[PDB]
Amino acid sequence: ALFTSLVGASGLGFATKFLSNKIRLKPAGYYPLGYVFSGVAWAGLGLVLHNVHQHSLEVLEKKK
Amino acid sequence: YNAISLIIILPCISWLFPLFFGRQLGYVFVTRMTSTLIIITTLITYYYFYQLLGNNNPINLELFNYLNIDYLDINYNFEID
Amino acid sequence: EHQRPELVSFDDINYNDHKKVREAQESYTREQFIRLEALKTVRKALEKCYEESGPNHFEDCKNLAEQYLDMLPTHRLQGYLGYQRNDPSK
Amino acid sequence: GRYPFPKDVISMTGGWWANPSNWKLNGLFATGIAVGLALWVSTATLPYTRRREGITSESDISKWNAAAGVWRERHGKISTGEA
Amino acid sequence: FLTSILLSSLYLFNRILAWQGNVKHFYLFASNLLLLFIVVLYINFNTFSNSFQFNFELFNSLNPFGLSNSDISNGLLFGIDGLSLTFILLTVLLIPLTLLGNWYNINFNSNLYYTLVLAIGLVILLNFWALDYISFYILFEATLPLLFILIHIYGSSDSERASFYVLMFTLSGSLFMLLSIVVISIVLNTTNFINHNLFVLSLDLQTIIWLGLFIAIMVKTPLFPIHVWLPVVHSESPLAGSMILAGLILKLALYAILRLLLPLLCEAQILYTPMIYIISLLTIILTSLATLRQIDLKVIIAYSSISHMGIAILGVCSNTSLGIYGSIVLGVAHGFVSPALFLIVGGILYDRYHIRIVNYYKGLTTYMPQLATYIIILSFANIGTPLTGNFTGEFLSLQGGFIRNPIIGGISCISVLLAAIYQLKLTNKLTGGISSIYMHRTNDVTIREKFIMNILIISTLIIGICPQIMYNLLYWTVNNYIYII
Amino acid sequence: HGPELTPAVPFFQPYVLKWAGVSLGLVAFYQFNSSYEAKNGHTWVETFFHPKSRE
Amino acid sequence: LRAYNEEKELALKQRLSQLPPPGKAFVTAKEAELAELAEIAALYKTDRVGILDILLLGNKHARLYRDNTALLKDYYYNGRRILWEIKREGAEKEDWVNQMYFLYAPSLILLLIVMVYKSREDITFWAKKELDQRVLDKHPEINDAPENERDALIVERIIAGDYDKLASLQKKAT
Amino acid sequence: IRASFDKAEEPMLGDYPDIDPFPAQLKNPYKKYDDQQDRRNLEEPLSVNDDLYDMWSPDRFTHFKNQDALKYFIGFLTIFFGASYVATYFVPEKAAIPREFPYEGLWKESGGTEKSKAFFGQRS
Numbered sequence A: 001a002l003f004t005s006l007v008g009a010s011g012l013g014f015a016t017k018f019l020s021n022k023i024r025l026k027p028a029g030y031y032p033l034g035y036v037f038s039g040v041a042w043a044g045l046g047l048v049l050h051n052v053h054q055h056s057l058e059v060l061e062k063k064k
Numbered sequence B: 001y002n003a004i005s006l007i008i009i010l011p012c013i014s015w016l017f018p019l020f021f022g023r024q025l026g027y028v029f030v031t032r033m034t035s036t037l038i039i040i041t042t043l044i045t046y047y048y049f050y051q052l053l054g055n056n057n058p059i060n061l062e063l064f065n066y067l068n069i070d071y072l073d074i075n076y077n078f079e080i081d
Numbered sequence C: 001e002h003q004r005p006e007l008v009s010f011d012d013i014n015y016n017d018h019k020k021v022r023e024a025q026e027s028y029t030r031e032q033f034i035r036l037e038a039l040k041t042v043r044k045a046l047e048k049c050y051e052e053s054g055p056n057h058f059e060d061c062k063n064l065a066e067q068y069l070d071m072l073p074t075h076r077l078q079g080y081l082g083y084q085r086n087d088p089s090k
Numbered sequence D: 001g002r003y004p005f006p007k008d009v010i011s012m013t014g015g016w017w018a019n020p021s022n023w024k025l026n027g028l029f030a031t032g033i034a035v036g037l038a039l040w041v042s043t044a045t046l047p048y049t050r051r052r053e054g055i056t057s058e059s060d061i062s063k064w065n066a067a068a069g070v071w072r073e074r075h076g077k078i079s080t081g082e083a
Numbered sequence E: 001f002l003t004s005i006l007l008s009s010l011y012l013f014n015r016i017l018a019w020q021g022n023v024k025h026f027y028l029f030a031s032n033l034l035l036l037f038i039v040v041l042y043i044n045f046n047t048f049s050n051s052f053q054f055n056f057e058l059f060n061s062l063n064p065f066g067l068s069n070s071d072i073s074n075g076l077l078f079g080i081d082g083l084s085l086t087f088i089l090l091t092v093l094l095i096p097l098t099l100l101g102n103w104y105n106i107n108f109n110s111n112l113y114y115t116l117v118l119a120i121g122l123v124i125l126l127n128f129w130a131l132d133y134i135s136f137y138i139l140f141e142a143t144l145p146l147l148f149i150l151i152h153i154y155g156s157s158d159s160e161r162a163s164f165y166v167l168m169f170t171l172s173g174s175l176f177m178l179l180s181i182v183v184i185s186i187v188l189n190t191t192n193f194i195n196h197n198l199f200v201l202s203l204d205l206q207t208i209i210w211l212g213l214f215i216a217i218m219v220k221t222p223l224f225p226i227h228v229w230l231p232v233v234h235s236e237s238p239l240a241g242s243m244i245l246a247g248l249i250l251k252l253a254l255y256a257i258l259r260l261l262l263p264l265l266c267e268a269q270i271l272y273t274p275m276i277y278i279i280s281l282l283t284i285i286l287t288s289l290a291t292l293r294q295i296d297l298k299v300i301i302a303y304s305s306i307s308h309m310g311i312a313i314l315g316v317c318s319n320t321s322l323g324i325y326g327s328i329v330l331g332v333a334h335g336f337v338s339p340a341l342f343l344i345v346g347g348i349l350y351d352r353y354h355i356r357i358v359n360y361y362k363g364l365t366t367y368m369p370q371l372a373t374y375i376i377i378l379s380f381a382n383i384g385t386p387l388t389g390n391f392t393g394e395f396l397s398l399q400g401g402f403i404r405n406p407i408i409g410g411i412s413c414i415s416v417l418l419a420a421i422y423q424l425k426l427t428n429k430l431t432g433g434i435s436s437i438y439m440h441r442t443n444d445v446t447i448r449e450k451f452i453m454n455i456l457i458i459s460t461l462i463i464g465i466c467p468q469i470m471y472n473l474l475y476w477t478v479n480n481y482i483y484i485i
Numbered sequence F: 001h002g003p004e005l006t007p008a009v010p011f012f013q014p015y016v017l018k019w020a021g022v023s024l025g026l027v028a029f030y031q032f033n034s035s036y037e038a039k040n041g042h043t044w045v046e047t048f049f050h051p052k053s054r055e
Numbered sequence G: 001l002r003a004y005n006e007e008k009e010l011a012l013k014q015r016l017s018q019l020p021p022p023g024k025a026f027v028t029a030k031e032a033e034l035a036e037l038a039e040i041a042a043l044y045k046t047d048r049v050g051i052l053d054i055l056l057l058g059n060k061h062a063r064l065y066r067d068n069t070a071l072l073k074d075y076y077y078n079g080r081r082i083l084w085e086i087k088r089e090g091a092e093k094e095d096w097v098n099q100m101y102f103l104y105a106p107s108l109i110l111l112l113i114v115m116v117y118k119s120r121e122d123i124t125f126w127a128k129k130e131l132d133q134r135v136l137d138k139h140p141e142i143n144d145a146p147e148n149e150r151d152a153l154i155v156e157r158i159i160a161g162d163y164d165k166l167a168s169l170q171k172k173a174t
Numbered sequence H: 001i002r003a004s005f006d007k008a009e010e011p012m013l014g015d016y017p018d019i020d021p022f023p024a025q026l027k028n029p030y031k032k033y034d035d036q037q038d039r040r041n042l043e044e045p046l047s048v049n050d051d052l053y054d055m056w057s058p059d060r061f062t063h064f065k066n067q068d069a070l071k072y073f074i075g076f077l078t079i080f081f082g083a084s085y086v087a088t089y090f091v092p093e094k095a096a097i098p099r100e101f102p103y104e105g106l107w108k109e110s111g112g113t114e115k116s117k118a119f120f121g122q123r124s
């Protein structure tokens, strides 16, 4: 599914925003808009990776 | 009234109750109670010996399964030979 | 309900299908259990013989005792693996 | 010997010279529970009792010996004694 | 729906951390919810089917985040039979008890400790679900860093060397396990707990493959050549680390020898059971003998766990239905009764006096009568004194080991004697005598300690009075691994 | 006279109530299922046993 | 579903501002200063918060409350160790007994009951019923015998015959 | 020091005082110790293999030397079994024959069939 891939990659973006907050000795929700910034960026990487795997499967089935 | 069962159950009562209720009943009660119950047990087994002198027909009681594995069953079975 | 699933062997089937292999597995297993309760039936019959017989149990159920002690090395759980990994007559 | 003991500590089997004031009163409860448990175990294990002899007919064991001879004829199984 | 459950739950967790400093209430709550969930799964479990009932795939290519409905499967499989679910029930009723076991002694950095303990419990929970060799192996060594951090930060004087040994010996055996797993995955091109009895390898390829898996099992159910990290990783761990270790890791390797070796190494296994019997008799006798001269108190229970696992291995390697069943009963009953002993030595005895040497402890009955009651009841439950589940496991495993080889069964039957010598030698020293002049009098055993003890004693007594209560899970898997042609 | 006394203790301690109540409830429930089996041909708890069929 | 007062809590915090540390507030081996601390213990004990404010409130209210309950818990338990404080009775609930007696223990008894009644469903009862069904399959004349004769007639048929079909399965062997 | 295994662990100790091992039972009971039960003063150095010289160790008899006692024990055993075995030669024999049995020695009663009569048979 595409939606589960997007939500999971956004969770990876939330994880990297959280961990970078906590390296800075900040609270968790220090700057809450960086969460949506990081989630949109990592979800875009998930979008790219999903589309490349999709085109790859189509190339593999065109060898029938 | 079951003679084969009272022989088993009355000393178990005579053990489990002095431990669980020793602080609550005390030594002067538990002494007379433990002895009283073993007296009743040994009167029952004299009477059962007197009856088995009548016919040599023993009694067993059966309980639940200990283990049933492939060729091997073990049951809690109790008979007075 | 006492349902009775069908009996499958290891030899007619393709092993690349898993339905039939799993059923042949369970079939051979449950047949060993049927064999086993046959052995247990003869054991309970023998101890009924011994308890009813008293002193002459040597000659009333010589044959029941011989039957129990002949069935005992051969009527147990043996496992499907030993027959499904190896073919005799090959 | 009646040496002093600490009353700090609580054991379930009583402690040193455990003799509560209401041991009559608790003794009536222990009496009731003991006779009720003995009576109830006595009647509960009644149908699980059977005699040793006289359970099954001798017809049964004669024909089971016969069927054991049947199961021994078909496998060609020989005696213990003949070698 | 299922994502909204989780970010509700993550918000639940964040709010209760914001208002309550501790985590332990929520970790207990999640543990008991996990209990109820596994028992609801046991209600819906079909015992009449040999197959794997509750299957799910993670990290498939068509759906990397979530479940998989596909024509092609290259992720990690998960699913259970009765053999898996036995150890899952044993695991899930021990996880709340180890979170409860350190409810008051960890003071400084509590939330880290309880997170590590619950994380180790969850990893070992998922170990029994796994269905690939690589899916088993990934979770099989996810425990090790968490164990390293737990043993190193919390412990006694010597927790550096114990944390190093729990990484070192486990990693060193388990790398050879990875060697054999790689050889299996390049011959078969499949790693799977479903198909893998159908594939037959050559005899000398099997005898090469079997060695690397057996070396890792020798490290982790610690048989005599390397049985040696175990007393130091016990004797210097914190309480929940010791409890989780000796209740679950050793039984996990006991599960791995059934799940990984007996299906596709049958023709190898028959060639090697005399060597396993050498090693298992030789780790019963020599470890049971080396316990008699021990100055420390948790080390005695560590060596006890060695001797009981040595009894269980000649049950699984017996080629008998009785031996397989008795090894499972021994593993489950040992996982009950041994963490209670580690609680006696590490919780009721190390929280009060902070020393573990045997020479300080004498005459514990006269100030602590019910602790002494616990000590003698657990000593006899650990020996092989019947109506306990330990005797059911030891008796059926000794019987299977007598069938497979009667002479090593004859010399393995003396474990009944040898297991009782050191245990009663410790128990009469702890209970008997005038009260110690070194120990000042402390509190008797508290409500939570008595609670943990009562649960771990009832669950041995129920298996000991009726071992049939878990035959409904095992009657397939007791026939599954037998190779008698 | 006789033995010296110690203070009075109530009989029904909390553990007596807890352990007796749980075990008497389990025995009563077992007898209830053996009651229900004779009337309906099946246990009351196997009403709740819903596994999938083997096929 | 429950709510709290915040300036009760800020008055609480500045009440605790002039109080001594808990490492000396009771080390005085009296109620000139030990009668204001048992008030504070009793205020630790009662529930200020309920669950509807936990979710919908922000965070420095939570931090305020958190250090409040930390210092209050400290004043409760150190006074309980050295010495409401000055009483002696047994009705008390520690923090774990809510979800170990009411969630862990009934789930464990549930596990027992599911194991006991799941043990009805096993291969030995089913296999004895299947073997009986097979000899009633082959020889239906046992059908019209009376009830306890039927038992022993089945048993003599079991002794008289295999009734497996195991050699039926090993066709490649034969 | 005194025992052979105590001598065997001599080169492994370093920075350890190397006590003479003395059994804790063979000490005087009437000298007042800190623990009267273990018979030990409060900071007294412990030997290596001290749990072989503790109060909880074996009883360690005082009256015979151990090689003497092994000689006396194996003495009494071979005394009894030697007199037992020589006394079998000086026995008198019986005043009856061993009694015999009807139905050709009850062989049908003792299980048996006619091919199996020597295996399950009596005197006749």
Ligand SMILES: CCCCCCCCCCCCCCCCCC(=O)OC[C@H](COP(=O)(O)OCCN)OC(=O)CCCCCCCCCCCCCCCCC
Pocket (backbone or CB within 6 Å): E054, E055, E056, E058, E067, E119, E122, E123, E125, E126, E129, E138, E139, E142
């Ligand atoms: C950190 C170490 C690194 C290791 C990395 C390895 C992978 C780590 C991934 C971490 C999370 C793994 C657990 C994911 C749980 C997913 C639950 C699940 O898959 O249930 C769905 C499954 C399919 O259900 P279905 O009927 O198809 O419909 C879906 C809607 N329920 O439903 C079923 O068929 C029944 C299955 C029931 C699920 C039981 C799962 C038991 C374990 C749950 C707790 C595990 C927590 C693990 C966290 C620590 C990770 C080690």
Ligand SMILES: CCCCCCCCCCCC(=O)OC[C@H](COP(=O)(O)OCC[N+](C)(C)C)OC(=O)CCCCCCCCCCC
Pocket (backbone or CB within 6 Å): B062, B063, B064, B065, B076, E461, E462, E465, E466, G116
């Ligand atoms: C000396 C040590 C004994 C210890 C006793 C401990 C209490 C157990 C009492 C059960 C007696 C009983 O309920 O038995 C009676 C029944 C019936 O017996 P049946 O013959 O199998 O069925 C009848 C067969 N007909 C039809 C041929 C006659 O049993 C059972 O099948 C139920 C098994 C339940 C066992 C679950 C035990 C769980 C642990 C309980 C303790 C914590």
